[PDB]
Amino acid sequence: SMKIDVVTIFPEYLQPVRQSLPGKAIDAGLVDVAVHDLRRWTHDVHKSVDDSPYGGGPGMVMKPTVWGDALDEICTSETLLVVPTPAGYPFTQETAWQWSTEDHLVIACGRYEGIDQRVADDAATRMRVREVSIGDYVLNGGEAAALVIIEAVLRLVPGVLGNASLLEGPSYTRPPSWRGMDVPPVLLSGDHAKIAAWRAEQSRQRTIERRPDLL
Amino acid sequence: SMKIDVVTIFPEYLQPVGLVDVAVHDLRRWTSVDDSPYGGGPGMVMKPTVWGDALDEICTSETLLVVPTPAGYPFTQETAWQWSTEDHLVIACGRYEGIDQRVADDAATRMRVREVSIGDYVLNGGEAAALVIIEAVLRLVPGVSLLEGPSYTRPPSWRGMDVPPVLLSGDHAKIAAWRAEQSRQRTIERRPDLLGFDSPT
Numbered sequence: 324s325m326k327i328d329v330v331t332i333f334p335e336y337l338q339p340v341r342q343s344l345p346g347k348a349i350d351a352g353l354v355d356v357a358v359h360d361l362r363r364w365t366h367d368v369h370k371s372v373d374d375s376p377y378g379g380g381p382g383m384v385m386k387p388t389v390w391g392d393a394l395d396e397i398c399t400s401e402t403l404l405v406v407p408t409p410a411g412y413p414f415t416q417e418t419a420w421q422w423s424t425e426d427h428l429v430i431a432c433g434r435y436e437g438i439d440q441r442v443a444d445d446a447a448t449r450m451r452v453r454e455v456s457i458g459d460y461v462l463n464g465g466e467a468a469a470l471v472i473i474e475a476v477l478r479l480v481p482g483v484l485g486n487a488s489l490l491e492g493p494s495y496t497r498p499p500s501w502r503g504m505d506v507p508p509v510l511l512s513g514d515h516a517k518i519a520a521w522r523a524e525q526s527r528q529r530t531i532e533r534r535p536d537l538l
Numbered sequence: 539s540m541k542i543d544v545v546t547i548f549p550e551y552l553q554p555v556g557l558v559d560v561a562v563h564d565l566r567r568w569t570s571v572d573d574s575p576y577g578g579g580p581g582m583v584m585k586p587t588v589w590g591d592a593l594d595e596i597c598t599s600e601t602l603l604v605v606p607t608p609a610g611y612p613f614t615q616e617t618a619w620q621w622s623t624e625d626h627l628v629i630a631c632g633r634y635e636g637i638d639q640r641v642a643d644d645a646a647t648r649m650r651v652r653e654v655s656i657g658d659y660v661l662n663g664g665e666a667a668a669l670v671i672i673e674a675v676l677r678l679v680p681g682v683s684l685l686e687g688p689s690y691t692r693p694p695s696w697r698g699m700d701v702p703p704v705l706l707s708g709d710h711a712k713i714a715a716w717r718a719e720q721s722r723q724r725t726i727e728r729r730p731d732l733l734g735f736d737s738p739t
């Protein structure tokens with residue numbers, strides 16, 4: 324039973340999440356995802372969410388006063404506050420497993436150069452805060468990271484998304500022959516110990532080739 | 539100029555997307571897209587037949603075929619730079635347990651193919667990975683290491699928390715030095731692998 328609140332200046336970006344949520348999971352009260360426009364907490368007629376960086380530099384920084392108000396309203400002491408950032412701890416499958424049993428995730432999506440650091444630092448004095456990165460590339464903001472985190476986490480919550488070391492090897496299905504390429508005959512052999520060993524060797528070879536760091 | 543075509547059985551999920559155009563294609567337009575795996579196992583595999591027909595129409599010999607997969611080569615900022623100067627990306631999004639391996643194998647006989655993963659976690663399909671890849675690449679298209687430290691803006695005191703005073707001092711050398719120190723500190727703590735040290739636990 325998980326509530327996820329996402330805060331963003333581009334709420335439309337989170338549309339895929341609401342799309343991928345089965346009615347049965349919502350009706351059973353297994354999951355609730357709500358998306359909030361950060362500008363609801365702006366102070367001025369211009370709905371300002373950013374300002375120039377202290378110490379100079381390029382880009383802009385999201386305002387602490389706006390974010391502070393948003394998180395004050397949405398979070399409680401029990402919230403796990405997730406803050407995507409290219410400077411975060413790595414988000415991994417282990418992370419996803421840990422977070423899948425949380426009652427309440429709040430994902431604070433930044434833009435520009437990110438969020439004034441005092442927002443996360445202040446929040447961390449009264450709730451659990453996690454600054455994380457989904458990989459070693461640079462995005463424009465936290466929304467795509469939120470999509471990835473939400474999917475990785477919710478697919479581990481029994482019955483929410485509709486789904487049920489070494490790298491996975493190649494997979495095959497019908498037809499047995501296609502554009503001159505036959506499915507490896509071992510897979511049609513009915514020798515299931517041999518099939519498992521073949522799959523194990525494929526996994527080994529692929530890991531050596533594509534992810535030697537895993538070895 | 540760059541053209542990006544995304545192929546998926548869930549075109550609705552790609553909604554978040556002059557020098558670049560992005561087009562989304564429903565795979566079913568070329569048809570049941572899946573069946574049980576040869577050799578056994580849980581779940582289903584996408585059949586190569588429908589994919590072959592779709593890619594035949596969409597791809598040329600100059601196309602870079604991108605195939606998200608948890609078993610891919612890592613997609614990194616270096617990859618994003620490399621792909622930023624491509625004329626044509628086609629992103630083939632799988633579902634279920636993935637796409638019959640012969641799709642990528644057949645495609646590689648006529649174009650360049652890249653199987654990639656955006657990170658070490660499991661998704662239900664390629665669509666979210668496609669959005670990440672598109673965003674990382676498009677921000678580098680012409681005409682568009684170490685972890686970054688913290689950023690601050692006004693007011694200089696908030697909830698009794700001060701912006702680090704060096705950032706208000708106007709001393710560029712000291713500001714550069716402090717920012718380097720925060721950055722070093724953060725990398726050691728959060729990503730020691732970037733500086734060639736063992737990863738935690």
Ligand SMILES: N#Cc1c(-c2ccc3ccn(Cc4ccncc4)c3c2)n[nH]c1N
Nearest residue numbers: 407408433434456457458462463464465468
């Ligand atoms: N997680 C994660 C990420 C992000 C990410 C996340 C949040 C924000 C907010 C703002 N930006 C843009 C930006 C900020 C600083 N430096 C450069 C660009 C973000 C990027 N990029 N790459 C990842 N793996």
Ligand SMILES: N#Cc1c(-c2ccc3ccn(Cc4ccncc4)c3c2)n[nH]c1N
Nearest residue numbers: 606607632633655656657661662663664667
């Ligand atoms: N890039 C990337 C990915 C994916 C991903 C990508 C494409 C597909 C198609 C199908 N699935 C689901 C699946 C398949 C096999 N094993 C487990 C789950 C996908 C996952 N997961 N994690 C990543 N970093």
